[PDB]
Structure 1
Amino acid sequence: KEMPQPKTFGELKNLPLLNTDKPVQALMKIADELGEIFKFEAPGWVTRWLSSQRLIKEACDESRFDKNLIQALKFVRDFFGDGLITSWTHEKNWKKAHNILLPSFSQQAMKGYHAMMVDIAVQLVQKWERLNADEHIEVPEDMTRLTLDTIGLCGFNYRFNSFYRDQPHPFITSMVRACDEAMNKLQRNPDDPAYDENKRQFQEDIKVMNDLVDKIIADRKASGEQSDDLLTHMLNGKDPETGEPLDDENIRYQIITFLIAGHETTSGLLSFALYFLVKNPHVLQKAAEEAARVLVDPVPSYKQVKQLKYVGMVLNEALRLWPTAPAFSLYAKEDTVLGGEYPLEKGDELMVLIPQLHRDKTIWGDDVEEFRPERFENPSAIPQHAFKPFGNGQRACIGQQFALHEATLVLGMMLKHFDFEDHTNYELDIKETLTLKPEGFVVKAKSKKIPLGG
């Protein structure tokens, strides 16, 4: 059997089809046309895109497939090194870092992070209480302020102070400018001297990111207070399987890795959640009644956040529709056959298209486009490998609980303290970098004038 494949363009193959700002959304349309699996090929690489739970469930068998880092994106590996997201499972520093950092995401870790999450969430709420009547909120912008600050403080006892800035922190601006520059070069005569300033600017941006990391470490060595946080574990934690802590080189990569991965997809999630709420007033009202019922104190306790059941369903359902890291990659460990129809040679690449997996009518029913948090009412009824916003198996998201606790806390406080109005009747416009975010999403928030504790 031939595997489906969209149209080719000489020896550019399918590559011209990604001549777009929204390639993941373009790939979803192709998935709609061609079905559960299709080959997609470019000059320097080939892969197969999977969209059905039946094939993805096989792809997620770790005895047969492991995590792949895509060659086309080596600029990422360049910058994040052998940090946890950009290391191969077989690499030494993957397992070492994994075992050293897992305890930083334990239940006792989360309880320890809670008060500092609240510190940043109170800042977000206060910003919004202080807006004049004529004004509105820039939602992804403010969610990015919250998430960057929350990972900075909880993780590294460093304050980005993003709510004290009108534009994004220099780290974000440099991050976005670096990772944009690197991505544009994929289709560059890249060595043309016309691009020299592009390369000089790229250098300046890595130097901002690197100075920040240095400050974080230096502040920590100098510190007078006791921290037991993510950075504490990076510095001092020892690999049980061998007794050594990470070296300085790898630690630097973990810091940059956690600063970035630890904020971006969480800001997207909050933004999409708020979008879906304001487009679904009955759901908003239900989420709001919960918030008001559960958050009875002036600030939320860890336990109260665990009781926001419906807010958690809201978040899972936003991650169903628009998983903010929308794809991951796998390779075949040995020759094997997928779905009893598609032969694969050792090393062959697969891509999981998460948003399309999440619209598999076989699994979810026909109403896959509706925003229905009630689907997660009973979470053990969702088949295995049907819902994968946090990836797979031993290479699944280490920060998953951190992300959901932060998001639930913040969304709960937002819904306690304000009524939200989609005052422009916003039309969803999804911007794609390596993640997904609504662009230009704005709302008004009318305060309920509920005082906010310290």
Structure 2
Amino acid sequence: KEMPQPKTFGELKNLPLLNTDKPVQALMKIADELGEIFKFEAPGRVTRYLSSQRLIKEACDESRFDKNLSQALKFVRDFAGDGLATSWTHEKNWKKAHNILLPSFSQQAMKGYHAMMVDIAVQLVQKWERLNADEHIEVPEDMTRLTLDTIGLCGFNYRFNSFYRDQPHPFITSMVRALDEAMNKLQRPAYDENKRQFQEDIKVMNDLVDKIIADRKASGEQSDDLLTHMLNGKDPETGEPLDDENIRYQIITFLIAGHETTSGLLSFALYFLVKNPHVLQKAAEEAARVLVDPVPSYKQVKQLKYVGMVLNEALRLWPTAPAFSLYAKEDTVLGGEYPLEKGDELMVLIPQLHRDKTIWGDDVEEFRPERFENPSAIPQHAFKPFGNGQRACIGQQFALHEATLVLGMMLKHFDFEDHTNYELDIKETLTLKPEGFVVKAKSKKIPL
């Protein structure tokens, strides 16, 4: 009835608790102490962090709760606009882009993106084949090169050529710095350079994306990318297409929402695999049995069943988009004891949800991909790495196809060594990643 709350700081209430370098991990420790729900107050803001499947299964009732833009998403909106991830459900452009973009993100549409994904994945494999002895791999750095390039190619047929670079393409530098400024605004006349740099980074992103859209319309060429689908698609409901400004925001959104979540997933999966050599061996055995051709086919990726469980278990422990926000559509009572008023906000703390011992058992911290043999045995709403309902991740099939393809090829082509006995250190941006995770790869000498 009375809702737990962590320690306060006078007038600032709970807010200084998030003035820390690892706020998600800080919130998980608070959840460890306070339980399934706690109130978090700041000046002009109240939200409630949910950690149990019991309460989150109610929060996922779309007749009772809708997606809220967290403060993070509101700051990302300044450059993602009314793209899918930073628009309200009630904004006309959300349902429009949702209806238009859903068929180009289907499992069936991944057949058409597969060749481009293979293109970047082969570049990653070739980079590792070309390392000299006792050189090593910087895992999140290379995974981020892979996912950024893959989304650039599948999104708007543009090659960032990240594997030809130390310093990323200017668009990426601006995007990364823009996200950083957005995240720095949370824990926040000396900011004049930050704002000037922020407007400057927005213009870099807008200019490049608007140019490619204009170039594509001028040329009239048709590609197998999201940009072509968006130039030609019409919303069945309104009968309208997306305008060029929103198409730009969707492209920027794909790059923001997709690249770091997906690269963090690959990075966490490889980390858990090298820390669990029996699991790695099982995944590598599947990769060798299934990937019989020099280039994986779309059909073979779907056959990487255990690799898929590996990725789901990595998403269980470290969901790389670690929270989402909801608001009550009407007055309602949560869990039979917490009354909420219309508009009241909730935060779903996904990594805590995925450690609910009433759901997963006492070994919640162990990496066991076998937990995902049967999705029917998993209770409703216990596993939410891609969000919920009509506001769930539209790029889920994309991300899992990319991650399964790349992890499969990595496991086919290399043995991995945790040569530093790497100590897990999770860096927090808007996503989570194992900072400083490094491995050595010894090639199995299998040609491409």
| Normalised-by-shorter TM-score class | over 0.9
Deviation at 1:63, TM superposition (A): 0.5
What does the per-residue CA deviation read over 1:328-360, in whole Å, with 9 as the maximum and x for residues that have no partner?
Answer: 000000111100100101000000000010000
Alignment correspondent of 1:91: 91
Please report how far the alpha carbon of residue 181 of structure 1 lies from its aligned counterpart in structure 2 after TM superposition: 2.1
Question: How much does 1:221 deviate?
Answer: 2.2
* Deviation (angstroms), 1:77: 1.9
Asked whether the 8 Å contact 2:74–2:86 carries over to 1, the reply is no
Unaligned runs of 5+ in 2: none
- Size of the aligned set, in residue pairs, is 448
* Residue pairs, 1:336-351, within 5 angstroms: 336-351=332-347
User: Alpha carbons of 1:84 and 1:338: their partners in 2 closer, same or farther (altered >3 Å)?
Assistant: same
Q: Secondary structure at the match of 1:263?
A: helix
Cα displacement string for residues 387-413 of structure 1 (whole angstroms, at most 9, x for unaligned residues): 000000111000100100000000000
Alpha-carbon distance, 1:187 to partner: 4.7
- Structure-2 change in CA distance of 1:187 and 1:30 (3 Å): closer
Aligned equivalent of 2:388, options 388, 392, 399: 392
Which one is further off, 273-282 or 151-160?
A: 151-160
Pairwise CA distance, 1:97 = 0.6
Work out the CA distance in 2 between the residues paired with 1:381 and 1:186.
Answer: 39
Q: What CA distance in whole angstroms lies between the structure 2 residues aligned with 1:224 and 1:240?
A: 23
**Once superposed, which parts of structure 1, at least 4 consecutive aligned residues long, lie more than 3 Å away?**
185-188, 222-225
Q: CA deviation at 1:222?
A: 4.0
Which stretch has the larger CA shift, 202-211 or 260-269?
Answer: 202-211
Q: 1:71 offset after TM fit, Å?
A: 4.2
Quick one: distance in 2 between partners of 1:111 and 1:164? 27
Deviations 1:135-155 (A, max 9, x none): 111111100010011111112
**What is the distance in 2 between the residues matched to 1:86 and 1:199?**
20
Once the two structures are TM-superposed, the CA of residue 194 in structure 1 deviates from its matched residue by 2.8
Report deviation, 1:213. Answer: 0.5
Mapped partners of 1:313, 1:25: distance in 2: 24
1:441 maps to what in 2?
A: 437
CA contact (8 A) 2:105 2:398 kept: yes
CA deviation map 1:97-143 (0-9, x unaligned): 10000110123311011011000000000000001113111111100
Q: CA deviation at 1:224?
A: 6.4
Q: Which residue of 1 aligns with 2:408?
A: 412
Out of 293, 296, 299, the residue aligned to residue 289 of structure 2 is 293
Deviation readout 1:196-252 (Å, 9 max, x if unpaired): 222222222112211221232133224464314311121121110121101122112
What pairs with 1:53-202 in structure 2 (closer than 5 Å)?
Answer: 53-71=53-71, 73-188=73-188, 193-202=189-198
1:325 aligns with 2:328: no
Q: Distance in 1 between matches of 2:80 and 2:117?
A: 25
Secondary structure of residue in 2 paired with 1:409: helix
Q: How far apart are the structure 1 equivalents of 2:49 and 2:156?
A: 37
Percent of counterpart pairs with the same letter? 99
Are residue 379 (structure 1) and residue 375 (structure 2) matched? yes
- Extract unaligned runs of 5+ from structure 1: none
Tell me which moved more, 396-405 or 75-84: 75-84
TM-score by length of 2: 0.98
Q: Is the 8 A contact 2:70 2:324 kept in 1?
A: no
Cα shift at 1:58: 0.3
Structure 2 Cα separation of the partners of residues 297 and 42 of structure 1: 56
Point out the more displaced range, 93-102 or 243-252: 243-252
CA distance in 2, matches of 1:159, 1:220: 15
| Contact 1:45/1:72, CA 8 A, preserved across alignment | no
Separation in structure 2 between the aligned mates of residue 435 and residue 53 of structure 1, nearest angstrom:
22
Distance 1:443 1:36 in 2: 37
Distance 1:203 1:444 in 2: 40
Distance 1:100 1:224, change over 3 A: closer
Q: Is the 8 A contact 1:48 1:349 kept in 2?
A: yes
Deviation larger for 301-310 or 175-184: 175-184
Q: Which moved more, 1:250-259 or 1:357-366?
A: 250-259
Do 1:429 and 1:438's aligned partners in 2 also have CA atoms closer than 8 Å? yes
Q: Is this contact kept in 2: 1:331–1:349, CA < 8 A?
A: yes
Give the CA deviation at 1:255. Answer: 1.3
Task: Say what the alpha-carbon RMSD is for the aligned residues.
Answer: 1.3
- 177-186 or 375-384: which moved more? 177-186
Partners of 1:317 and 1:372 within 8 A in 2: yes
**For residues 16-43 of structure 1, what are the alpha-carbon distances to aligned partners after superposition, in whole Å with 9 as ceiling and x for unaligned?**
1112100000000000000000001111
Range 204-213 or range 71-80, more displaced: 71-80
Larger mean Cα displacement after TM superposition, 206-215 or 134-143: 206-215
Q: TM-score, normalised by structure 1?
A: 0.96
1-structure distance, mates of 2:278, 2:240: 54
In structure 2, C-alpha distance between the alignment counterparts of 1:222 and 1:265, rounded to whole Å:
33
Moved more, 179-188 or 82-91: 179-188
Q: Residue 370 in 1 paired to residue 366 in 2?
A: yes
**2:415 and 2:443 in contact (8 A); partners too:** yes
